[PDB]
Amino acid sequence: SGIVQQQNNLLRAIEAQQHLLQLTVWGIKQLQAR
């Protein structure tokens, strides 16, 4: 349970890092678009 929960946390950490990635890409495109 401790090991399995940690895996969930690590995954969720990634998932949210991925949303932060997509946002910065948007940000870079807007800047480029200007």
Binding site: Q5, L10, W26, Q30
Partner: protein, 36 residues
Amino acid sequence: LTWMEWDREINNYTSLIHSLIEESQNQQEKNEQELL
């Protein structure tokens, strides 16, 4: 999407990230004492 909304989403997910990692630290340390 606007630059105002983007700011809000950057903030929140950064917070979520700080949140998840802090929680992974606690679980980490815990999983280790469970092992030693």
